[PDB]
Structure formats: C-alpha cells, structure tokens
Write a protein that binds this ligand. Structure first.
Ligand SMILES: [Mg+2]
Ligand SMILES: [Mg+2]
Lengths: 191, 153
C-alpha cells in the first residue's frame, strides 16, 4: 500500500516546515502507485520562485550557492540533467544538525553541509565533476523551486489528482484551483 | 503569406520563455513541430497547456483565442525516474538519477560523469551478479534506492 509515496513524504515535510500543517493524503484502493515527477505542479509558480543553478562541477561554487540561501527557506530541488532523468528532493536547513539537508523520502535523505557551510561526504555526492553544467539538453543543473504555500498546495493537489486520476486531470486541476484539495486532510502542528 | 506572422511565448518548467513565429490560422501540432526545431523535442513528448487546458493537435490557435504575445506552457510527458546508489570498494557512495529503462551502459555513462572512470573500466554488480551492458535496470529488478557495487577492470 503506497510503495511510491516519496512525493507525499516530501510534500508533507515542506508543509510541516512552512505551513505548520501535517497532511494526510486519503486514498482508496486503485491508485497509481508510481513515481511522480513534480515538475508540472510548478508551471504556475512566479519566475522569481524558480531558479536554475549550474555550479555542481566544483565543490566551492556549490558551497557558495548554498551559503547564499536563506536558512528559513525550503525548496523543492531537482538534480539530474535537462533532457533526462530528474529527481526531486526537499532542501531545508535542519538547525539541530547545523546544515542543509536533502530529503527525498523517509529512507533516502542526507546532510548536504556541515556547521561551517562546507559539503559533507554525502553533499559531495551532488557534484558532477566530469560533465558539463548549464541550461542545454544533457547538461547537469539544479532547479530550485521555493516551497511557498502556493507551490506546496500545487504539489499536493497535483500528486493527489495524478494518483486518483491521471497526469492530464492533475495539470487541469492545478490550473483551476489554489487551495488544498478537500480530501487532503490537514491538521495544525507547531513550528 | 501577406498577413505576416505573430509572436507567442512558450514557457517551460525551468522558468525560461521560448519565442515562436506563428499565424492564428495555425494548428497546435504545427506549433509543437516548430518547438521541435527550436529546442529539440519531438511533438509526442510535449503537451501544450493554455488557459488551463491541454490543447488538442487538430484545433487552431484562433479556436483557443491564443492571441499575439500569449503564453503557452510546455510540459513534458512524465518519465519515471529514481535514485540509485553505487558503492565502490573504497566505501564511497555515488548517487545516480536514472530511469528503470536505462541500460547498464547508460548507467556506466552516468558513473563516468561523476567519477571520470571510462565505462570500459567499470563492472557493475547487483544482488551478487554482474550486470551486462545491453540489459536495463528493470531487467535486474533494480528499483528506487537500490544499491549497486562498482568494481574496476
Ligand atoms: Mg481563496
Ligand atoms: Mg557523460
């Protein structure tokens, strides 16, 4: 029952950190238990909330991009190549560990940086030293999407409708709606 | 023809806006065909979204009231991706972004990107078995967060 719930777990994490809200996606038997690419959920986002980094060839230029980030902000963060396989994860600063964390699922997450803003062994994993970075097809890049209230809601609705219906219906739902789908139960929590 | 052309804007998932020369007479498939030349994507993988809805290939821009300087959204048909991990005998873990349909060759290519090790020198092992270059990840039931092992040759 929900093997491929990475999208829900990431979205719940962002909602906890930003909205002070736990989300429960109330599904029935017969859903699409598949990996969900969140990309289309962010098509309506303002341009200032989507940014492409091209710094992952070298440790120091990535550390620098990371050190620019505001430590109270949360991002949906896509790694991979422009034409190809992309992976979404949540990027947040966990004050308890004093570093940026990448959270893809309950079973796949790592600390990106140490207390002094330098990459950990796992953070060095993000680097792709022997291929080119940029905006052209086949280049490596990072895409940062602000996990604003609006982007969290779009991601939540997109996943919910994708799983219960299909991708086309989810795109159309996200175009018409800006509030959490009624079947996504929220419960307030402290932040 | 003598009416000239007009400019519309195709916005993408990265934030970029791409510009096309079109006429109101044009179909949606024509527009995808133009997008093919300008950024390198076949029509079949692309969806054009405007005023909420996905646009059908046989209708015209004018039918959709797609006017001078309007903005379409280009969104790609969704591919399955996952992360996998490659352990080396040094104990380092390499994290790859892959698809289930990726060949073992494609995977060694992604390993090269990270490590600079040419595919020729790589042997990959999953569940105690050597992986063959022409098979796919799904052939070996390699799934999300699976851990492979890299040995040099
Ligand atoms: Mg309202
Ligand atoms: Mg390469």
């Amino acid at each position: 029952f929900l093997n491929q719930n990475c999208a829900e777990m990431m979205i719940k994490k962002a909602a906890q950190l930003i909205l002070g809200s736990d989300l429960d996606f109330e599904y029935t038997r017969g859903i699409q238990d598949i990996q969900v690419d969140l990309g289309p959920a962010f098509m309506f986002s303002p341009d200032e909330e989507k940014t492409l980094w091209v710094s992952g060839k070298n440790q120091e230029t990535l550390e620098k991009d990371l050190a620019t980030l505001n430590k109270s902000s949360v991002y949906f963060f896509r790694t991979g190549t422009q034409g190809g396989a992309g992976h979404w994860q949540v990027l947040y600063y966990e004050a308890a560990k004093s570093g940026w964390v990448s959270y893809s699922s309950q079973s796949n997450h790592f600390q990106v940086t140490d207390s002094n803003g330098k990459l950990t062994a796992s953070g060095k994993g993000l680097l792709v030293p022997h291929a080119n970075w940029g905006k052209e097809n086949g280049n490596y890049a990072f895409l940062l999407v602000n996990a604003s209230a609006e982007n969290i809601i779009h991601a939540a609705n997109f996943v919910y409708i994708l799983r219960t219906q299909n991708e086309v219906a989810a795109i159309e739902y996200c175009a018409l709606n800006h509030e959490f789908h009624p079947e996504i139960k929220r419960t307030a929590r402290a932040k | 023809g003598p009416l000239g052309s007009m400019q519309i804007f195709v916005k993408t998932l990265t934030g970029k806006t791409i510009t096309l020369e079109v006429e109101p007479s044009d179909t949606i498939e024509n527009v995808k065909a133009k997008i093919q030349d300008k950024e390198g994507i076949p029509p079949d993988q692309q969806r054009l979204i405007f005023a909420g809805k996905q646009l059908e290939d046989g209708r015209t821009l004018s039918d959709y009231n797609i006017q001078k300087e309007s903005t379409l959204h280009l969104v790609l048909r969704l591919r399955s991706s996952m992360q996998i991990f490659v352990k080396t005998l040094t104990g380092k873990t390499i994290t790859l972004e892959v698809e289930p349909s990726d060949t073992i060759e494609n995977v060694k290519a992604k390993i090269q990107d990270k490590e600079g090790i040419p595919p020729d020198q790589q042997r990959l092992i999953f569940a105690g078995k050597q992986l063959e270059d022409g098979r796919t990840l799904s052939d070996y039931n390699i799934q999300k967060e699976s851990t492979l092992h890299l040995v040099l040759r």
